[PDB]
């Protein structure tokens, strides 16, 4: 989210995600991007 | 030993938990039977 | 799937009740199907 | 449609897979039904 730096789309940068504690509710409650869908998942049940 | 609406460890269910006999190889800890039911858990 | 409960451990009220009706008209005939299915049975029995 | 055909060779996935859902629920009955038709005329068979 403070990203530095991405990759470009034609060769879109790839990232590993696991083994963490991430709230993804503060993303809703945080309305800071200009789209925020969560298409196969509820926002407002994943912090938990 | 007393059945309630529980969310275990991010797996969620309802039921009773209670110490079980089972074998449940190191490699699991929580394995679904018919419903996709737990057996033993963590068991 | 054939649980709800994931759905509504990560789905919405709308998306998850639109295939929980698609999930519940399969249960409604398979339930009935089972009992026409029995009380076909049910006649053979009364004719024996 | 009566059709799946035309569908596969003129839709997208997504939509022609729900309008076969629908197709093969139609289906589906129909057959269970038949064979509900049958098995009441094999008990009045049965009986005969
Ligand atoms: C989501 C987020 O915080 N993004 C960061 C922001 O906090 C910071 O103020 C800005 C300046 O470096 O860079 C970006
Ligand atoms: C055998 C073992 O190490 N179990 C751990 C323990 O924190 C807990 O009993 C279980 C329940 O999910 O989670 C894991």
Do not use: H, M
Not at chain 2, 13 to 31: A, D
Request: glycine content about 4%; proline content about 3%; some cysteine.
């Amino acid at each position: 989210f403070n990203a530095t730096r991405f990759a470009s789309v034609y060769a879109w940068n790839r990232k590993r995600i696991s083994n963490c504690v991430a709230d993804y509710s503060v993303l809703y409650n945080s309305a800071s991007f200009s789209t925020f869908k969560c298409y196969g998942v509820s926002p407002t049940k994943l912090n938990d | 030993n007393k059945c309630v609406n529980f969310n275990f460890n991010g797996l969620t269910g309802t039921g009773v938990l209670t110490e079980s006999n089972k074998k449940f190889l190191p490699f699991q800890q929580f394995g679904r039977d018919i419903a996709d039911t737990t057996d033993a858990v963590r068991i | 799937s054939s649980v709800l409960n994931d759905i509504l451990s990560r789905l919405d009220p709308p998306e998850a009740e639109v295939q929980i009706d698609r999930l519940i008209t399969g249960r409604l005939q398979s339930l009935q199907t089972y009992v026409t299915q029995q009380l076909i049975r049910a006649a053979e029995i009364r004719a024996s």
